Amino acid sequence: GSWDCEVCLVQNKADSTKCIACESAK
Amino acid sequence: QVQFKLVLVGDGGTGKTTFVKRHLTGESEKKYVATLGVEVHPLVFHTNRGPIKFNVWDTAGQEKFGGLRDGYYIQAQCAIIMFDVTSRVTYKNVPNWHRDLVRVCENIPIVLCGNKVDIKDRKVKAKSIVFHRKKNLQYYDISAKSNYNFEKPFLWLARKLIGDPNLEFVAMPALAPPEVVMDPALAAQYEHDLEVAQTTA
Ligand SMILES: Nc1nc2c(ncn2[C@@H]2O[C@H](COP(=O)(O)OP(=O)(O)O)[C@@H](O)[C@H]2O)c(=O)[nH]1
Ligand SMILES: [Mg+2]
Ligand SMILES: [Zn+2]
């Protein structure tokens, strides 16, 4: 499912492979 | 866990970093985001309905050279726009910050903060602070260096986001001790001046 970025803490979709904000990988 | 991305914007030198760093755990547990050159401070506040965490995005000074990148703003759920009550140009630029913000974020709750009110020779006074009224925003005087009104913007935002007008903070977060004294009389006067200004015009 959705995943919280461990770099910037933004909530991302399941589809998202990288953070919509900071580009960090899942 | 309830958490919200909060973007903190305003002209360089207005006291954004000084403001966010008052929150001691927020500073000890901050996370650097190398790609955007941002530090995210997780600021927990304890409310009558449990903890709320504001993940505050503070720049690394890039605002001095132009607008912030889309990635800075993205997924923001709330914001504080800061200006310096000693620098009129910082207030003149508030509408610009608001524009750049709403361009990316739309709907979100926003508090306007006039910082550095501990400084006697104040230039931007209550009667001149109008932008919030024009745009349905909440305004607070603050002084990052003295912790004056530190919790106010967060509490207003929490009430708005949670949809509970009776939300309270059970206690203040642990803050760095005041580096300057905010004269209680001065604070009283400024609070009155804002009241008078609010009922005016
Ligand atoms: N007197 C006073 N000075 C402040 C306050 N907040 C910040 N400053 C000073 O303003 C300057 C810029 O602060 P800074 O946090 O770096 O502002 P930023 O560029 O917006 O992040 C520094 O010299 C701070 O010490 C305040 O509440 N009162
Ligand atoms: Mg800064
Ligand atoms: Zn991220």
DSSP string, B74-110: TT--EEEEEEETT-HHHHHTHHHHHHHHHHHHTT--E
Whether residue A22 and residue B5 make contact (CB cut-off 8 A), yes or no, is no
**What number does the ligand 1 atom closest to the CA of B143 have?**
27
Q: Probe ligand 1: pick from B14, B16, B18, B140, max atoms within 8 Å of CB?
A: B18
* Cβ atoms of residues B142 and B117 within 8 Å: yes
Tell me which H or E stretch contains B112.
strand B110-115
Domain count, chain B: 1
Radius of gyration of chain A (CA): 7
Side chain identity, residue A8: C
Query: How many other C-beta atoms lie within 10 A of the C-beta of residue B134?
Result: 9
- Can you name the residues that pair with B84 across neighbouring β-strands? B115
How is residue B109 written in tokens?
Answer: 């709750």
Do the beta carbons of residue B151 and residue B170 sit within 8 Å?
no
Helix (H, G, I), strand (E, B) or coil at B31: strand
For residue B164, what are the CA distances in angstroms to B49, B123, B128, B158, B168? Answer: 10, 35, 31, 8, 9
In whole angstroms, give the CA distance from residue B154 to residue B78: 10
Atom 24, ligand 1: residue with shortest CA distance? B15
Give residue ranges with CB within 6 A of ligand 1: B 12-18, 115-116, 118-119, 143-145, 180
DSSP B14: S
Q: Are B81 and B113 in contact (CB under 8 A)?
A: yes
* Cβ count within 10 A of residue B108: 20
CATH number of the domain to which B115 belongs: 3.40.50.300
Q: Does B36 touch chain A (CB under 8 A)?
A: yes
Cα–Cα distances in angstroms (integers) from residue B29 to residues B56, B89, B162, in the given order: 12, 33, 24
Identity at B145, one-letter amino acid code: K
Backbone angles phi, psi at B57, to 5 degrees: -95, 115
Radius of gyration of chain B (CA): 16
User: Which residue in B14, B140, B20 sits closest to B83, CA to CA?
Assistant: B14
**Can you say which residues of B are annotated as belonging to the binding site?**
11-18, 29-35, 61, 115-118, 143-145
In 3D space, the residue among B155, B113, B111 whose CA is nearest the CA of residue B136 turns out to be: B111
Contact B108, B54 (CB under 8 A): no
C-alpha–C-alpha distance, residues B201 and B198, integer Å: 8
The total number of residues written for chain A in this structure: 26
User: What is the DSSP code (8-state) at residue B3?
Assistant: E
- What is the SS3 assignment for A19? coil
Q: Which residue has the tokens 């926003």?
A: B110
Q: What is the bridge-based pairing of β-strands B2-9 and B38-47?
A: unpaired
Closest CA to A5 of B110, B42, B101, B16: B42
Instruction: Classify each residue of B23-43 as buried b or exposed e, where b means 16 or more C-beta atoms within 10 Å of its C-beta.
Output: beebeeebeebeebebbbbbb
What approach was used to elucidate this structure?
X-ray
Chain B from 13 to 32: CB within 8 A of any A CB: 31
Annotated binding site of A: 5, 8, 19, 22
Q: Point out the residue among A8, A11, A21 whose CB comes nearest to the CB of B31.
A: A8
Show the DSSP H helices in chain B as ranges.
Answer: 16-20, 24-28, 70-73, 88-92, 94-105, 131-135, 152-162, 184-199
Task: Look up the domain containing B156 and give its range.
Answer: 1-201
Measure the CA–CA gap between B13 and B5, rounded to whole angstroms: 22
Residue B166 has what DSSP assignment? Answer: T
| CB atoms closer than 10 angstroms to residue B170 | 11
